[PDB]
């Protein structure tokens, strides 16, 4: 449980550190929906279907 908590806290710390950056959100919240769908999220689709 403590290892999981450390993982979660480190990840949320990194997420805050990248969220305070104005640049990151603009090209990182719409790319996964649109820009990463055709050639990055398609690895996710092929992996889950596999």
């Amino acid at each position: 449980r403590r290892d999981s908590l450390l993982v979660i806290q480190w990840n949320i710390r990194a997420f805050m550190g990248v969220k305070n950056w104005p640049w990151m959100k603009l090209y990182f919240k719409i790319k996964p929906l649109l820009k990463s769908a055709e050639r990055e999220k398609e690895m996710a689709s092929m992996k889950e279907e596999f």
Binding site: R1, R2, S4, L5, L6, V7, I8, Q9, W10, N11, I12, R13, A14, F15, M16, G17, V18, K19, W21, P22, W23, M24, L26, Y27, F28, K29, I30, K31, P32, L33, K35, S36, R39, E40, K41, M43, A44
Partner: protein, 138 residues
């Protein structure tokens, strides 16, 4: 080796960020972001602050990479949250999560607690949305 996981494909993302194909991101190319969604003088000259200079491609990759040194796969976060509580319904109250994290993982102060509250306002804390939004997987 830098940019270990989830970034070897981010080269494609940076390529599609650029439009005039000059090997990097152009100073005036930022309007594509305005086309991707207001850009002002602040947004125009914030390039110098967030980027030392329009020189190369891989250096920009690494520069945007140090922000994501703590990145991890979304499925790993989902697994960690699921093994945290086998029910996995995200009904854990916000303050309950805050107290567990403060007392066990790291000494989270108020200036972190308020930011975490802003990240996910209490309903509790449904971990599904948080794990989807940290990687922006929705």
């Amino acid at each position: 080796m830098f940019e270990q996981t989830q970034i070897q494909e981010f080269k494609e993302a940076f390529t599609i960020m650029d439009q005039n194909r000059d090997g990097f991101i152009d100073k005036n190319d930022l309007r594509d972001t305005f086309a991707a969604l207001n850009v002002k003088n602040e947004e125009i000259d914030e390039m110098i602050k967030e980027a030392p200079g329009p020189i190369n491609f891989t250096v920009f990759l690494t520069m945007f990479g140090e922000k994501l040194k703590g990145a991890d796969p979304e499925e790993t976060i989902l697994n960690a949250f699921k093994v945290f509580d086998p029910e996995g319904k995200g009904v854990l109250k916000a303050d309950y999560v805050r107290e567990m994290l403060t007392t066990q993982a790291e000494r989270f102060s108020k200036e972190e607690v308020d930011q975490m509250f802003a990240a996910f306002p209490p309903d509790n804390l449904d971990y599904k949305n948080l794990v989807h939004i940290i990687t922006h997987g929705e």
